Write a protein that binds this ligand. Structure first.
Ligand SMILES: [Mg+2]
Ligand SMILES: [Mg+2]
Ligand SMILES: [Mg+2]
Ligand SMILES: [Mg+2]
Ligand SMILES: [Mg+2]
Ligand SMILES: [Mg+2]
Ligand SMILES: [Mg+2]
Lengths: 138, 199, 92, 103, 45, 142, 10, 70, 69, 61
RNA sequence: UAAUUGCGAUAACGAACGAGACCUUAACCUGCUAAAUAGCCCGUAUUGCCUUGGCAGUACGCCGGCUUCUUAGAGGGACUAUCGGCUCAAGCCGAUGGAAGUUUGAGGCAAUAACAGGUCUGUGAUGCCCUUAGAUGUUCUGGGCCGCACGCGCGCUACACUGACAGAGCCAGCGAGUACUCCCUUGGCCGAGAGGCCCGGGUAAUCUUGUUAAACUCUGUCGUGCUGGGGAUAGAGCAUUGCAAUUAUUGCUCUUCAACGAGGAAUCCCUAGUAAGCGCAAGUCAUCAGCUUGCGUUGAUUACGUCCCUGCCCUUUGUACACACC
């Protein structure tokens, strides 16, 4: 039937759920186009998974993503992490892996973080983060 | 369509920074390689790396973000990489216009020339100093060179009509050659001179 | 139950050591692997002191101290003052 | 015999008894040929209280935080009103039950 | 008609009241803990 | 091809719709301009003269993106920090009358209507057609 | 100016 | 990574009591231990199986002082 | 220390015969060597940009820099 | 000054009152036979290269 | 080896505490069990653009399907599974599957013997003494605990262009809420502002709440002048809370516009989601946070050492010290 795959990406507190449906080469983010949803200087941090791979490999793929929670850079890190898994899951499931293996190896040699998440959270303590109160005379 | 027309010019060629290339790297000396990492190009400096877990993880790391990190100090400028990345990129744009060479072409020679080769060590002598005048490792040399350039820019731009956008830019071109009128050289010559005296 | 039995032994005239020892013996026949009684206060002197009686195994560290250990404490009034008692028993 | 779409709410402090309560209720209900809806998983309610450990204020200043966890575990059924009376029998201590006809 | 969250403290204080009263009254009779089972319109101790 | 609201940058679009609304030049003003504080947290009035028109237009942009919104929501959306002096800053909301009347006047222009069935104000059929027409007027203007 | 007491010698 | 006596006593007794039916593979030791032992913790179950499979590596290559499997 | 907020012919004449040789022209440069106020310098940037002698490299709301054509 | 380049071949513990100074065995990387002993302030790996202005001075131990 | 943690030699053998073991939590499980106070897809109805099949949207289904996201249970795997370079052994470092192997991270609990340490002002826990009807008991009115030539501590806003001001863009989490009297509060109207009036929802994954917070980003004004940085001090006017606001409880409007250019001898804290910057929730509360306990956004320079100062542990050694180098 219809060709589709579902992926999700996570960050510290930013969740980015993605729907990959066989389409015609259309990319839209959070409703907004790719021109808008990012800070102005970090919009570059969105195009690398596309430019490193080539636009010719996005012939019949459509992606719709909803992201929430966290901060601006958490959201952009969630979407950049979600795109790699969406494309590799669609190619692995629906087409020959001759593309998939070269996509995966070339992308991970450029950056390993596309497939694995970075675990970092905060630690509670009874004086603040890691520093205590001032002491009188040592 | 899906890509901007600006980046479409460079996407056909090999991957590089949009404004400037990473080819034609300096041939000037040795013993400073293997600690400056340029084999993997990066578009924007900003990156959430894992370089602060082991000892020498910072040796394999792009230089540009390290400069951005050292550029932000003195309490107020904590966490503002959005501001820092634009300022550093503009500084490379400013330095590009005074010299046809690549901004990284000038920047690498700037770092490689402003690194001290000797330093004085503190050995206790019951109130006196037995300064042995030890040498400096290359990694500490580049680490301190970055600090000198950043504190020089911050001190110069402090309480001055100039702005940090070109205030940072002017040291890189000044330090590219042996001008001797920069803050980094002011600290550098004093350190070798005191080591020379205290040998 | 032993805590009130010790209470009864202390209200009527009787040596504190003998009453506590009787408690220690009374624990053992039931099948407890260990027991411990702590008595504090003025041991016939102006200065106060404390005594400990212990038998069998003992745990101090883990969270099993909250459930595997049964503990109790009571206050007893005397003609001249107050004496404190603490009893712990571990049941297998 | 008119169906009323019953719903019963549960609350307790401990967690193990409620799970086997629902485990026995679902089997007690399926065999009578009643349309049963699954045991949805309600969020756990965590509550915290902070107070000073020391009772006098002398020495260093240190605090301790007590906490408490609650589970709800809602379940619903479609059946007449009289049938659920004999289906909610044999409950043990601790677990309280509240019935809502939801007519 | 009160919320469950406030109810769970009232029944805990109710259990504490039973324990404290039994310490102050039945200490001679070998008191060792109690347990309360609540049922609609009737309760057991 | 066809374009919509999503196809244009919000910052440049709002300037374009303010220029478009200049040409009609008919929105009632109760004289509140140049005297209101526009917000407790704020301290200076806006320099630009058509701040009332860019603000009324911006209110219509956000109501275009939300399904039901009221004065309280616009009250706290436009709030910011206030310098209370030597105390640390906090978050307080903007002025209420300016934001209430700037969108109360927007009803009679046939841009958005009441939502009394559940509350608030929503966008109307022919009201959206104006922003839709200006979407094509700006999109291919590039 | 001059302090005594505690541990000092010679 | 230093193991206390509790694991040590169990490892010697299991190794000497049941030598031949079990081999150098760790996967087998994990599922074998609980039928022939009463252990209240999964992590300790991993602890005993993990060391016992390392010990059989030295049993296969020569003898160890203090162990005499049947 | 104080600069001039108005531009007279005595300052006008330096511009149209000197701006052909500067590599960079900025607000800092004008307040530095032209001895003019910063607001007047920013005006000097904007009136002179439209006559068609200098080209934009990068534009921003806080600082702007211009070079030769 | 005829500044020369030298490379480190082995590190032998950390000396000094505060561990700032390090003791290494270096190789002249121009005459592979020659080898002397120097002191270094920063972290050192094998095959690292250092720049030496003067070699005649030798350090303790 | 983080450890009296072990390998082993042995006039010692076998045992009991502590560490560990243990418990909660962050991690992870494209399986099993399920889910309209949780979601997704599917089918429709259906607004606008472009017709186009299309795109941005909105509504319905209550056995249309799913659970992939989400939740919560049971058991999985974490044990280094496997592997490299050392060693007979105890043990340490790295890689691949894996998010991880630094004990994955951080906590709770945590030995014998002790201090003339703190508390009779927490307790209807308590000895002795004292006043007990001209009361040290209880209670009502008013004031005080905040009173100011001065030295000291824990903190907040600042000494500006790496800045201020004005418009626009726009991203969280932990929590809290209705009585025998109104508790968080949506929507509508009036009101510069603080506030006032009128319907309505929520004993709460349903409503407040998507808590669309701050930081931050774009476009403009100001231009190094203690100035548009900084807001101490004081006058006038308008409001809510409480029985009662003066030595104003607090808030709002206009005006007044101090000191303060990175701070002497000295001195505190800290190893990755860490320091610092910034805000939010809860507590005490009719109202007031510059306080504490937690929660989240953005997130760094240098080291992965040693016992030099100031301290801790084991052995040998010296003593005229045992209230023990005060
Ligand atoms: Mg904390
Ligand atoms: Mg133990
Ligand atoms: Mg201890
Ligand atoms: Mg009194
Ligand atoms: Mg002033
Ligand atoms: Mg408060
Ligand atoms: Mg002697």
């Amino acid at each position: 039937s219809v060709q589709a795959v579902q992926v999700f990406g996570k960050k510290k507190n930013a969740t980015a759920v993605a729907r990959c449906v066989q389409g015609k080469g259309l990319i839209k983010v959070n409703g907004k186009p790719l021109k808008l949803f990012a800070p102005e200087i970090l919009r570059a941090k969105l195009y690398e998974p596309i430019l490193i791979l080539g636009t010719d490999k996005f012939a019949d793929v459509d992606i719709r993503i909803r992201v929430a929670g966290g901060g601006h850079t958490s959201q952009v890190y969630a979407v950049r992490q979600a795109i790699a898994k969406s494309i590799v899951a669609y190619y692995a499931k629906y087409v020959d892996e001759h593309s998939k293996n070269l996509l995966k190896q070339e992308l991970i040699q450029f950056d390993r973080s596309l497939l694995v998440a970075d675990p970092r959270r905060c630690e509670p303590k009874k004086f603040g983060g890691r520093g205590a109160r001032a002491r009188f005379q040592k | 369509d899906v890509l901007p027309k600006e980046v479409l010019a460079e996407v056909g060629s090999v991957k590089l920074f949009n404004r400037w290339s990473y080819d034609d790297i300096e041939i000037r000396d040795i013993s400073l390689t293997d600690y400056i990492q340029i084999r993997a190009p990066v578009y924007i400096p900003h990156s959430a790396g894992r370089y602060a877990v082991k000892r020498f993880r910072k040796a394999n790391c792009p230089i540009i973000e390290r400069l951005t990190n050292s550029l932000m100090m003195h309490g107020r400028n904590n966490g503002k990489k959005l501001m820092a990345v634009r300022i550093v990129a503009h500084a490379f744009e400013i330095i590009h216009l005074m010299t046809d060479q690549n901004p990284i072409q000038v920047a690498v020679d700037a770092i490689v020339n402003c690194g001290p080769r000797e330093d004085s060590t503190r050995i206790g002598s019951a109130g006196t100093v037995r300064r042995q005048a030890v040498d400096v490792s290359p990694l500490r040399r580049v680490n301190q060179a970055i600090a000198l350039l950043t504190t020089g820019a911050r001190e110069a731009a402090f309480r001055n009509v100039k702005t940090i956008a070109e205030c940072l830019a002017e040291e890189l071109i000044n330090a590219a050659k042996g001008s001797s009128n920069s803050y980094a050289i002011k600290k550098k010559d004093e350190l070798e001179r005191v080591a020379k005296s205290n040998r | 139950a032993q805590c009130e039995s010790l209470r009864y032994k202390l209200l009527n005239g009787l040596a504190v050591r003998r009453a506590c020892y009787g408690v220690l013996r009374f624990i053992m026949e039931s099948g407890a692997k260990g027991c411990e009684v702590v008595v504090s206060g003025k041991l016939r002197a102006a200065r106060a002191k404390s005594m400990k009686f212990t038998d069998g195994f003992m745990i101090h560290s883990g969270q099993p101290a909250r459930e595997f250990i049964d503990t109790a404490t009571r206050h007893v009034l005397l003609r001249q003052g107050v004496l404190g008692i603490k009893v712990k028993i571990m049941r297998g | 015999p008119k169906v009323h779409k019953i719903r019963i709410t549960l609350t307790s402090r401990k967690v193990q008894s409620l799970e086997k309560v629902c485990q026995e209720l679902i089997e007690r209900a399926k065999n009578k040929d009643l349309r049963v809806k699954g045991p949805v998983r309600m969020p756990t309610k965590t509550l915290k209280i902070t107070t000073r450990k020391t009772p006098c204020g002398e020495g260093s200043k240190t605090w301790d935080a007590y906490e408490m966890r609650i589970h709800k575990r809602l379940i619903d059924l479609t059946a007449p009103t009289e049938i659920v009376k004999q289906i909610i029998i044999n409950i043990e201590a601790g677990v309280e039950v509240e019935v809502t006809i939801a007519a | 008609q009160i919320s469950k969250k406030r109810k769970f403290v009232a029944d805990g204080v109710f259990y504490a009241e039973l324990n404290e009263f039994f310490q102050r009254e039945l200490a001679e009779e070998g008191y060792s803990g109690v347990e309360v089972r609540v049922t609609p319109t009737v309760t057991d101790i | 091809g066809g374009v919509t609201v999503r196809d244009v940058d919000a910052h440049k679009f709002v300037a374009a719709y303010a220029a478009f609304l200049k040409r009609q030049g008919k929105l009632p003003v109760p004289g509140w301009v140049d005297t209101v504080k526009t917000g407790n947290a704020k301290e200076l009035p806006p320099q630009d003269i058509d701040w009332w028109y860019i603000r009324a237009a911006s209110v219509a942009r956000h109501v275009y993106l939300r399904k039901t919104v009221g004065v309280g929501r616009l009250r706290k959306v436009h709030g910011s920090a206030k310098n209370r002096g030597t105390r640390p800053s906090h978050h307080v909301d903007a002025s209420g009358s300016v934001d209430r009347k700037i969108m109360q006047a927007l009803e009679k222009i046939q841009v958005l209507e009441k939502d009394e069935e559940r509350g608030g104000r929503r966008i109307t059929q022919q009201g959206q057609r104006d922003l839709d027409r200006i979407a094509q007027t700006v999109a291919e203007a590039d | 100016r001059r302090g005594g007491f505690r541990g000092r010698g010679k | 990574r230093v193991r206390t006596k509790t694991v040590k006593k169990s490892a010697k007794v299991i190794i000497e009591k049941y030598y031949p039916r079990l081999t150098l593979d760790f996967e087998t030791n994990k599922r074998v231990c609980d039928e022939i032992a009463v252990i209240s913790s999964k992590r300790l179950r991993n602890k005993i199986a993990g060391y016992t499979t390392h010990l059989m590596k030295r049993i296969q290559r020569g003898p160890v002082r203090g162990i005499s499997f049947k | 220390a104080q600069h001039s907020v108005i531009l007279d012919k005595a300052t006008s004449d330096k511009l149209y015969k000197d701006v052909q040789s500067y590599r960079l022209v900025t607000v800092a440069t004008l307040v530095d060597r032209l001895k003019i106020n910063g607001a007047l310098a920013r005006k000097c940037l904007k009136d002179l940009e439209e006559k068609g002698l200098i080209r934009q490299v990068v534009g921003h709301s806080k600082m702007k820099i211009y070079t030769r054509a | 000054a005829p500044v020369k380049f030298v490379k480190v071949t082995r590190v032998l513990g950390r000396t000094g009152s505060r561990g700032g100074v390090t003791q290494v065995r270096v190789e002249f990387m121009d005459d592979t036979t020659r080898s002397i002993i120097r002191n270094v302030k920063g972290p050192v790996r094998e095959n690292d290269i250092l720049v030496l202005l003067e070699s005649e001075r030798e350090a303790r131990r």
